[PDB]
Structure formats: structure tokens, C-alpha cells
């Protein structure tokens, strides 16, 4: 039995859980209408969480509302924060969010999300407020993809594709179950390291000794060069390319790499970053890296990228 073990690694918010969900959609018939119903509350919760996160950031970043009236909605939001913990988003709550998301001050703060920590499901949910606020609303599969869930252990998914048995593990941030956790690192066919390209312009936070991209690099450096992984494919998912492309128009890559003398085209930057990662591989004669530029929330893109990742696996054990 040729059985394939895949381990997802990468900093938090790099798209790991999304890739997992994406395998369920692409290779395991997705989510049934029942399951979609179960994420109703999650969608509502994340929406509430997302708008709160911006509101709270306004206080810290010292940004006034566009219209002074919104102060009431801010106060109203915290009162109503729990309203959706079952089913409906009351009409009253939807208007609060609608009016806040509209406001010029809130927006200025949303533009400045590099200056704090705003999740990338935020605008997806908020721009579709009108749609999700209907009482009859059933989450679409794209809505489920965009859900942000706390996990407290190892996430696993399994499927059969091209006559091969795939087991994929997103080992969490919790070693609160070692051994099973350590095992996820054992007998791996391919490691898939995710990088949020769009982190390149994030401000150096007060709890960091280097920016997020270099943290991702340091991490990749150690995975890539670990003697345990000599016989394991290293696959690099430079992810969030959609966001990266928009950002790079405005924020120079020199923000992330001061020494960078290239240009702020999507093409030239993405290539520079790839090089920064791939140069970390210190065994180039005995190992090569498989870089892919992905948008993990885009089912069609992932299908294609994963299809290609599989083709290499097939062509691999036909040699070895």
C-alpha cells in the first residue's frame, strides 16, 4: 500500500487550516447542508469579532469616527455582542455593524490594519453583511472556508485521490498531547510550509525581535535543514498572493527587506521573497524545494496547486 503523509507547517495565520478545509471541499464532497448550518453561528461570531477588533483599534491608534453618531453604535455593539450566539442576527445588530462598516473613520483604521492585528476573514464577512443578516441565511461553502475556529489539538484529514491514500495533519499550537504530536513529524512524505506573503508590510510589533516574514524564514530555515527530514519533500506555499499583490502597489517591499533594490511589481517582489526562502536551504545538491504561489481561500487555485503536488509524488515513487 502506497500511503501518503502530509504535514502542514507555518506561522499562525498562514493558511494551514484553510488548506485542510480545502481538501474536504476538493476531495471529500465538501460540507453537507447540515454542516453549513452549524457554521451559521461561527460566521456571525467572526463578523462580530472582526468589527470589534477594528473598533477597539481606533481607540489605540487614535482615530475619530467619520460621523460622531457612531459612538453610540460602538457602545451598542458591546451590548449586543452576544445576540447571535444562537441563530439570528437581529436587525438591530445588523444595522449597528452596517453603519460602522460604512463609516469613514472605521475605514481609515481598516486601511491601517498593518499597524495592528486584523484577521483576513474580516472584510470578506463584512462586505457580505446584507447577505448573511437574512434570517433564512444558510452559509455557502465559501462562507464555511472563511470561518475562523479555535482548535486545541491536532487537526487531521484523509482522502483517496489518484489511487493514493492521503493523510494530512495540521499539528496545532498545542503540545498538550505530545507523542501523538511528535508523531505527526514522523514518516512524512511531504512537508507543506505556508507563508503569508501579505505579512511583509506588518509593523514590527512590540513582542517581536524581527518582523513576521523573518520569523517565518527562521522557522523554514530550521524545518528545511533538520537531519530528520533528509528524505522528505519540502513544499513551499507562498500564500495570500491576492492580498500581497494589492499591498505591494502601495507598500514597498523594503519595509520587510531594507536591502532590496528591485522594484515594487508583484512579479519582481514575489520572486525576491521566494529567493530569500529558498536560499535558506543549506543542502542544495541533495535537496530541492517546490515553491507554489497560492491563494488558499480560492478552491480552484488549491485544486490546481495540490494536483501538481500530487503529480510530483507520483513521479517520485516511480523513481525511488
Amino acid at each position: 500500500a502506497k500511503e501518503v503523509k502530509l504535514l502542514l507547517l507555518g506561522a499562525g495565520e498562514s493558511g494551514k487550516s484553510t488548506i485542510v478545509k480545502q481538501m474536504k471541499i476538493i476531495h471529500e464532497d465538501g460540507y453537507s447542508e447540515d454542516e453549513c448550518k452549524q457554521y451559521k453561528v461561527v460566521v456571525y461570531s467572526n463578523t462580530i469579532q472582526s468589527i470589534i477588533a477594528i473598533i477597539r483599534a481606533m481607540g489605540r491608534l487614535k482615530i475619530d469616527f467619520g460621523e460622531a453618531a457612531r459612538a453610540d453604535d460602538a457602545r451598542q455593539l458591546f451590548v449586543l455582542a452576544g445576540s447571535a450566539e444562537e441563530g439570528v442576527m437581529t436587525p438591530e445588530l445588523a444595522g449597528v455593524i452596517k453603519r460602522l462598516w460604512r463609516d469613514g473613520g472605521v475605514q481609515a483604521c481598516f486601511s491601517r490594519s498593518r499597524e495592528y492585528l486584523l484577521n483576513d476573514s474580516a472584510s470578506y464577512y463584512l462586505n457580505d453583511l446584507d447577505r448573511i443578516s437574512q434570517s433564512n441565511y444558510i452559509p455557502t461553502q465559501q462562507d464555511v472556508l472563511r470561518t475562523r475556529v479555535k482548535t486545541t489539538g491536532i487537526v487531521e484529514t484523509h482522502f483517496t485521490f489518484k489511487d493514493l491514500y492521503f493523510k494530512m495533519f495540521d499539528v496545532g499550537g498545542q503540545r498538550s498531547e505530545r507523542k501523538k504530536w511528535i508523531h505527526c513529524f514522523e514518516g512524512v512524505t511531504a512537508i507543506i510550509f505556508c507563508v503569508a506573503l501579505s505579512d511583509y508590510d506588518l509593523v514590527l510589533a512590540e513582542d517581536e525581535e524581527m518582523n513576521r516574514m523573518h520569523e517565518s524564514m527562521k522557522l523554514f530555515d530550521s524545518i528545511c535543514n533538520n537531519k530528520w527530514f533528509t528524505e522528505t519533500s519540502i513544499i513551499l506555499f507562498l500564500n495570500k498572493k491576492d492580498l500581497f499583490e494589492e499591498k505591494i502597489k502601495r507598500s514597498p517591499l523594503t519595509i520587510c527587506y531594507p536591502e532590496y533594490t528591485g522594484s515594487n511589481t508583484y512579479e519582481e517582489a514575489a520572486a525576491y521573497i521566494q529567493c530569500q526562502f529558498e536560499d535558506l536551504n543549506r543542502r542544495k545538491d541533495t535537496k530541492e524545494i517546490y515553491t507554489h504561489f497560492t491563494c488558499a481561500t480560492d478552491t480552484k487555485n488549491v485544486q490546481f496547486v495540490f494536483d501538481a503536488v500530487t503529480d510530483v509524488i507520483i513521479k517520485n515513487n516511480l523513481k525511488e
Partner: peptide, 22 residues
């Protein structure tokens, strides 16, 4: 190597006030 630690620390930093339990 402190290799397992480094990973543990990295992947845990994922905006928990903006995620929800299931």
C-alpha cells in the same frame, strides 16, 4: 535543537480573540 519549541511558539500566535470554539 529547540526545534519543537520554535514551531509550538510560531503556530500558536494566531489571533485568538478573533476565532471561536466549535
Amino acid at each position: 535543537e529547540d526545534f519543537f519549541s520554535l514551531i509550538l511558539r510560531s503556530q500558536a500566535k494566531r489571533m485568538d480573540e478573533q476565532r471561536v470554539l466549535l
